[PDB]
């Protein structure tokens, strides 16, 4: 679309209001010409065709509860943008400013979200198990981190590499969370999952086994559901990434934390520079200590926190 920016107002998910970058001709459009070569969200209206209808609203007010979704995944997208930029340099997904599209209504009473390849993709939930899914800033930049992903490292979606693929989105999804300041935590969906439930998540990051992901390497899923365990498995890169962070005691390993830009600042750089696409996490933690190597230097408490850290899982 061609058009005049502007800037329109509504309220997401969760019900707070928030101002969100709009285009005007005719229509206002969920069209943001302010980052890169544009974010756009689309009405895929329940049906899965894609990427449906650029959405359009009449008078740039975003209060209708059909909205809410569409004003939230527009919204944070704008945030995983501006994260990526402000803090690693890095320009869009590909490093190019490339556009951000990602549709909501996805279906119906779909569970789920996803990066398909050129896009995201949000479901609205059923309403039990899920609210719509882009409410959830960690969901919204893990997401996105699949697109960085694919564009560098390229993990393949499987076994090992699945697994740090998921990991990857799952530590980015957190950073972000924390760079907005949106009541951060190192849990992961937490604000549109279970919404009948309070306290839980769909993973936790700083605790995997408490819902039943492995928290070392000897627990490791080895069948094949979900492609080899990516979902399951990536507990074990998680809790080394949530131990470098924070520091901690686990199967009577010791590890000082370095804090969380310092573990942002490492896996940038190992995703970017040292991985590739049938990487293990053998290989993973071989990355990970050249990174901290580069930045800090060998003899660095943070190539040491990235040892322990490794160690306390199982990783060698
Ligand atoms: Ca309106
Ligand atoms: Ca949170
Ligand atoms: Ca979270
Ligand atoms: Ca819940
Ligand atoms: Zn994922
Ligand atoms: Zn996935």
Redesign the pocket.
């Known amino acids: 679309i061609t058009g005049t920016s502007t800037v329109g107002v509504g309220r997401g998910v969760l019900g707070d209001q928030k101002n969100i970058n709009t285009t005007y001709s005719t229509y206002y459009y969920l069209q943001d010409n302010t980052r890169g070569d544009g974010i756009f969200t689309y009405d895929a209206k329940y049906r899965t065709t894609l990427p449906g209808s650029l959405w359009a609203?009449?008078?740039?007010?975003?209060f209708?509860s059909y909205?809410a979704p569409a004003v939230d995944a527009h919204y944070y997208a704008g945030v995983t943008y501006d994260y990526y930029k402000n803090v690693h340099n890095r320009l869009s997904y590909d490093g190019n400013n490339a556009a951000i599209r990602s549709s909501v209504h996805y279906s119906q009473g779909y569970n789920n979200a996803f990066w398909n390849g050129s896009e995201m993709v949000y479901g609205d939930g059923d309403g039990q198990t899920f609210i719509p899914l882009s409410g959830g800033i960690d969901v919204v930049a893990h997401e996105l981190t699949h697109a960085v992903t694919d564009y560098t490292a390229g993990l393949i979606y499987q076994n090992e590499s699945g697994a740090i693929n998921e990991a990857i989105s799952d530590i980015f999804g957190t950073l972000v969370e924390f760079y907005a300041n949106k009541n951060p935590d190192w849990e992961i969906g937490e604000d549109v999952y279970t919404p009948g439930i309070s306290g839980d998540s769909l993973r936790s990051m700083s605790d995997p086994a408490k819902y039943g992901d492995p928290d070392h390497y000897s627990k490791r899923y080895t069948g094949t559901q979900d492609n080899g365990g990516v979902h399951i498995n990536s507990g074990i890169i998680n809790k080394a990434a949530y131990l470098i962070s924070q520091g901690g005691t686990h199967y009577g390993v010791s590890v000082v934390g370095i804090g969380r830009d310092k573990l942002g600042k490492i896996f940038y750089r190992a995703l970017t520079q040292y991985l590739t696409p049938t990487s293990n996490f053998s290989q993973l933690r071989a990355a990970a200590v050249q990174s901290a190597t580069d930045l800090y230097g060998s003899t660095s408490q943070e190539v040491a926190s990235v040892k322990q850290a490794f160690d306390a899982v199982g990783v060698k």
């Open positions: 609203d009449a008078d740039n007010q975003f209708a909205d």
